[PDB]
Ligand binder design. Structure first.
Ligand SMILES: [Mg+2]
Ligand SMILES: [Mg+2]
Ligand SMILES: [Mg+2]
Ligand SMILES: [Mg+2]
Ligand SMILES: [Mg+2]
Ligand SMILES: [Mg+2]
Ligand SMILES: [Mg+2]
Ligand SMILES: [Mg+2]
Ligand SMILES: [Mg+2]
Ligand SMILES: [Mg+2]
Ligand SMILES: [Mg+2]
Ligand SMILES: [Mg+2]
Ligand SMILES: [Mg+2]
Ligand SMILES: [Mg+2]
Ligand SMILES: [Mg+2]
Ligand SMILES: [Mg+2]
Ligand SMILES: [Mg+2]
Ligand SMILES: [Mg+2]
Ligand SMILES: [Mg+2]
Ligand SMILES: [Mg+2]
Ligand SMILES: [Mg+2]
Ligand SMILES: [Mg+2]
Ligand SMILES: [Mg+2]
Ligand SMILES: [Mg+2]
Ligand SMILES: [Mg+2]
Ligand SMILES: [Mg+2]
Ligand SMILES: [Mg+2]
Ligand SMILES: [Mg+2]
Ligand SMILES: [Mg+2]
Ligand SMILES: [Mg+2]
Ligand SMILES: [Mg+2]
Ligand SMILES: [Mg+2]
Ligand SMILES: [Mg+2]
Ligand SMILES: [Mg+2]
Ligand SMILES: [Mg+2]
Ligand SMILES: [Mg+2]
Ligand SMILES: [Mg+2]
Ligand SMILES: [Mg+2]
Ligand SMILES: [Mg+2]
Ligand SMILES: [Mg+2]
Ligand SMILES: [Mg+2]
Ligand SMILES: [Mg+2]
Ligand SMILES: [Mg+2]
Ligand SMILES: [Mg+2]
Ligand SMILES: [Mg+2]
Ligand SMILES: [Mg+2]
Ligand SMILES: [Mg+2]
Ligand SMILES: [Mg+2]
Ligand SMILES: [Mg+2]
Ligand SMILES: [Mg+2]
Ligand SMILES: [Zn+2]
Lengths: 104, 99, 83, 208
RNA sequence: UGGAGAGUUUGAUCCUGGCUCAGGGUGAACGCUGGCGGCGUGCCUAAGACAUGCAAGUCGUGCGGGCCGCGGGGUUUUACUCCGUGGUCAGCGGCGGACGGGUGAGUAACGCGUGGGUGACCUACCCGGAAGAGGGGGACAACCCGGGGAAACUCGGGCUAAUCCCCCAUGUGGACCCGCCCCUUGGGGUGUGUCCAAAGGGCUUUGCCCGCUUCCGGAUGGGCCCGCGUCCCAUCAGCUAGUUGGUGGGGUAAUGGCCCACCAAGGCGACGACGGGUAGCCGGUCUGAGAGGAUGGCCGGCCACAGGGGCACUGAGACACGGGCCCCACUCCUACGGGAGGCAGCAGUUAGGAAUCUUCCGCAAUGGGCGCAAGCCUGACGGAGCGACGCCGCUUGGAGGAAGAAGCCCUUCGGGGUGUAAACUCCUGAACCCGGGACGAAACCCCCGACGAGGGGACUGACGGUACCGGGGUAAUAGCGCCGGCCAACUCCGUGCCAGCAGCCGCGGUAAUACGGAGGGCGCGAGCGUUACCCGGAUUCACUGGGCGUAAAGGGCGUGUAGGCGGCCUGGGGCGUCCCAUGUGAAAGACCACGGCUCAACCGUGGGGGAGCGUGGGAUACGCUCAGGCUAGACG
């Protein structure tokens, strides 16, 4: 079965491509506590049909480009930057904890 | 010394010089056909295209191209010619092309 | 070319073969595709040759190609008897 | 190879009386009858309370020297007994008791276990027909253990199976003094055996 | 069915805590010692360098020749020449040389593992099905002739065969463009146009065998892609410009920045990017009560490599260990112009090292390549050799034999011990001798039969004259460590903080169970002990299973980002979680049973279990999520 995944479009800054942030939980192999963990897939969007904030499903596909191996299957729930927001802030903290520092 | 399957390298060289040639004809004629379709010269362009098709299918006859390779060639050729001719605003004057 | 042959499995001076289906290119004792019988050359026990002709008949039906000895045993097991 | 060397001294050290010989370890001789104390210079001085180790040590030594088997073999057997279903203690005794040499000793073909060993070694003993000469061979229930046709005329075997006329045999065995045959009926149980051994201690000795 | 702890901080105590020991393990090495057999195992260092032999070929049923020879013809003789046949040699052509064998350098990566995807693909030989092979043309070796080179080797001219190459036809069919239909990434169908087939050979010769062509299907093997998993250092924090995506094109069997041109300005990172270090990954293995830790050697699977670096050719498949080209290093030959090599194949040499074997036998068996077959090749393989290197099995004897020899040792001088030990008697009888002597081998092949099914016949073993069987037959190897506590085993003498011991505590400066010897003793035994390394004890990195007032350990305080965690009631979803069924979880190994070798080791057959992941179905208490409500937290 071609793998199907669900994540949030955290980037529509490309031509016919969207970055989908897929999240997944699971027990820690030794400590058992359930831990969240995520990943970004560059899904193909031929019709630039998906916008920043959409919760789409990604489908395993025949390679489209290096890095692109998934296609946007269908939209699950439109708009919701509450999720995108998280992502961006996590990003913002980066440029900080290097040579000088971040925020609070 | 001397492992007589030196014959193999002997043969390989001849086989090489053999494919080497067939592929050149192919390339050349293809260009020729393409170049003409470009010019808009209907008849002649197509005519040449047939030789091209022929040599290609023929190269695939032995082991100089075989199957897909040849199929890929033919498509890309008929592809370009069709387009170039249509663009040139030229009516396909017989020979080749299932128009 | 897939074949039906014998694979060494006994031990020094105590040979025991597994009638097997495998690609001709495999080691003789490497990964086979399917075991379809066994054979004890020295008949150390009453049951020194089992064959499961059902399966043999299948592999043969798909291009399996027995070794001259593998066939001898397959035959003995009635794999070819048509009657 | 097996021990060899003064035996009626192990008896002394082990305290208990081991029967590592025949006729004599019954005569008023087997040292335990004369000087029932360990060998060597200090054999008679007072003995200090033995350590838990010493206790477990000796117990094993005893049980083991009875069947005059090496530590290697003795240990392996133990590990097997340990791995099977059922009380290790009993099982272990059962396996030791299933050694061919022992069974031959049990049937009276031999005066002592050592003698039994040599009988088996010199092919004087047979198991279900085929002759076996492995003192370590494991007799299973059902096996008939006879004396070699060829050997049935050996003075010693005559003398022995003669004295056997009358003598009873373990409830897990059956002897046919007649044709010099014997049969292994079943694995003896701990209740069947009367060894001066505390198997619980031996099991513990290997716990450490 | 599974879990032991001890010594050592003190004058003593309790705690904390490190150190140390008893156990198991090994591709071992070293010391002393060493009798047999079976099975297994044996360069861990220089992926250093390698003499010599061997290690991949095979087809005369694809083709034409050269050389040596025999026979028969056309010849009155001669010259000249035709046919048949033996041997031999390459050459052309074909299939194999991409397997098998080796190694682990590199690689932290879709490399490997596990589960999936391929409407994005390939597959020689093999199997099933459908259809087909008509006509014509050419060339290059061999061979002949001439040239150049020291050699390796090469150049020119002439002739010639084929299942070598090409052209025309036939088009079952198939390929491409375009259209339409059904399907849904490039799947399947259909119409017009164009395009593409083939080779023959053998005969028990009008038939049968071997082969050839196009096409569909199968089978096997394989490419590519994806989820999850895969060591250390953050005293490595920012990395990236083919770099991220797009459009068109190239390239491939095929997707893809794989490559290119243009365009856009992106992509990755603390869930640790980038960088450094280390390392082939796995089934497994060792240890452990388990969880875990350590490991990847034999064997099996995958990857990578073939003196170092790069490259492509030929092919179904190679970027090709025993093929090619170039550059580099090193070695060898040279008339200095130029040539030749690559044992990480088998055996062997040499170097390094604490340390790792025979230049063995055989192709009989199993497996492989070529062949119609006979058969040929096979250092793959089956065996044998050497090494207690490991494991299992076995011997150096058995019974009797004194209130007790001798010697040695101790003594309270009475005696005690070594000791039934010996001597000695009887008994058996490993070695060794003699005789017999094998399974592993029945196929290919021949004959009958239809070259089928089936039936009959013939050839063939390195191991080996070995195993095993029978007769005869000799009492016939024992060593090593230890004895203060941990820890089983004590005395005398010598020595005098010396000489020495030592794993830890410690022992030795004249009464030492601790040093050396002796007597005695304990442990194990063809072994015993040491050194090294892994796990254990160590709940001493604590998930199971620890801690931080004074023992090591609370951040100098706050504000607060990410993140972790979240009160009560209802409803929806069903992601976590739980359940059932199903696929997968190779073999080997592990567990159990039965069985083969006299046992066992070792091995055969069968059975059982098995985490994780895929798919289908179900449950909804708790965690989650969405929607609604509450006021006990919080805030006002
Ligand atoms: Mg050839
Ligand atoms: Mg038990
Ligand atoms: Mg003190
Ligand atoms: Mg104390
Ligand atoms: Mg302590
Ligand atoms: Mg000739
Ligand atoms: Mg080939
Ligand atoms: Mg690295
Ligand atoms: Mg990966
Ligand atoms: Mg081929
Ligand atoms: Mg010429
Ligand atoms: Mg041809
Ligand atoms: Mg048709
Ligand atoms: Mg044609
Ligand atoms: Mg790129
Ligand atoms: Mg992440
Ligand atoms: Mg390495
Ligand atoms: Mg533990
Ligand atoms: Mg756990
Ligand atoms: Mg190829
Ligand atoms: Mg090839
Ligand atoms: Mg080829
Ligand atoms: Mg090919
Ligand atoms: Mg080739
Ligand atoms: Mg090929
Ligand atoms: Mg080929
Ligand atoms: Mg080929
Ligand atoms: Mg090619
Ligand atoms: Mg081919
Ligand atoms: Mg090669
Ligand atoms: Mg080589
Ligand atoms: Mg052979
Ligand atoms: Mg063969
Ligand atoms: Mg005696
Ligand atoms: Mg003690
Ligand atoms: Mg001195
Ligand atoms: Mg003194
Ligand atoms: Mg000491
Ligand atoms: Mg001393
Ligand atoms: Mg032994
Ligand atoms: Mg631990
Ligand atoms: Mg804890
Ligand atoms: Mg602590
Ligand atoms: Mg403190
Ligand atoms: Mg504070
Ligand atoms: Mg917060
Ligand atoms: Mg809650
Ligand atoms: Mg669920
Ligand atoms: Mg399952
Ligand atoms: Mg048995
Ligand atoms: Zn006694």
């Amino acid at each position: 079965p071609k793998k199907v995944l669900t994540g949030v479009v955290v980037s529509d800054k490309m031509q016919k491509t969207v970055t989908v942030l897929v999240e997944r939980q699971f027990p820690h192999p030794l400590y058992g506590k359930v831990i969240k963990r995520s990943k970004k897939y560059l899904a193909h969007d031929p019709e630039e049909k998906y916008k920043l904030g959409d919760v789409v499903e990604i489908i395993e596909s025949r390679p489209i480009s290096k890095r692109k191996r998934f296609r946007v299957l269908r939209l699950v729930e439109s708009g919701r930057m509450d999720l995108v927001e998280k992502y961006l802030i996590r990003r913002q903290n980066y440029q900080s904890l290097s040579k000088r520092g971040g925020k609070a | 010394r001397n492992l007589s399957a030196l014959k193999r390298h002997r043969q390989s060289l001849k086989r090489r010089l053999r494919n080497k040639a067939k592929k050149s004809a192919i390339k050349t004629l293809s260009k020729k056909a393409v170049q003409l379709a470009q010019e808009g010269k209907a008849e002649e362009a197509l005519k040449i295209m047939r030789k091209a098709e022929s040599l290609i299918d023929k190269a695939a006859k032995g082991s100089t191209l075989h199957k897909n390779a040849a199929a890929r060639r033919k498509s890309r050729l008929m592809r370009k010619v069709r387009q170039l001719l249509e663009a040139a605003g030229a009516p396909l004057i017989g020979g080749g092309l299932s128009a | 070319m897939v074949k039906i042959r014998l694979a060494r499995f006994g031990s020094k001076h105590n040979p025991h073969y597994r009638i097997v289906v495998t690609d001709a290119r495999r080691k003789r004792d490497g990964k086979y595709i399917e075991k379809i019988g066994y054979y004890d050359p020295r008949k150390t026990t009453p049951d020194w040759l089992k064959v499961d002709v059902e399966r043999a008949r299948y592999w043969l039906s798909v291009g399996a190609q027995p070794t001259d000895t593998a066939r001898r045993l397959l035959r003995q097991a009635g794999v070819f008897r048509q009657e | 190879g097996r021990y060899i060397g003064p035996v009626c001294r192990l008896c002394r050290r082990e305290g208990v009386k081991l029967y590592l010989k025949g006729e004599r370890c019954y005569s008023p001789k087997c040292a335990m009858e004369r000087r029932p104390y360990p060998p060597g210079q200090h054999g008679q001085k007072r003995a200090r309370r033995p350590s838990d180790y010493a206790v477990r040590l000796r117990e094993k030594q005893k049980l083991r020297r009875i069947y005059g088997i090496s530590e290697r073999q003795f240990r392996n057997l133990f590990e097997e007994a340990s791995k099977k279903k059922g009380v290790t203690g009993s099982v272990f005794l059962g396996l030791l008791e299933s050694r061919l040499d022992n069974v031959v000793y049990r049937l009276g073909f031999a005066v002592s276990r050592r003698q039994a060993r040599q009988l088996v070694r010199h092919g004087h003993i047979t198991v279900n027909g085929r002759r076996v000469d492995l003192p370590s061979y494991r007799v299973r229930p059902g096996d008939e253990i006879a004396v070699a046709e060829k050997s049935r005329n050996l003075e010693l075997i005559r003398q022995n199976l003669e004295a056997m006329k009358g003598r009873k045999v373990g409830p897990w065995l059956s002897l046919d003094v007649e044709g010099m045959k014997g049969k292994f009926l079943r694995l003896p149980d701990r209740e069947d055996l009367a060894l001066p051994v505390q198997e619980n201690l031996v099991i513990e000795f290997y716990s450490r």
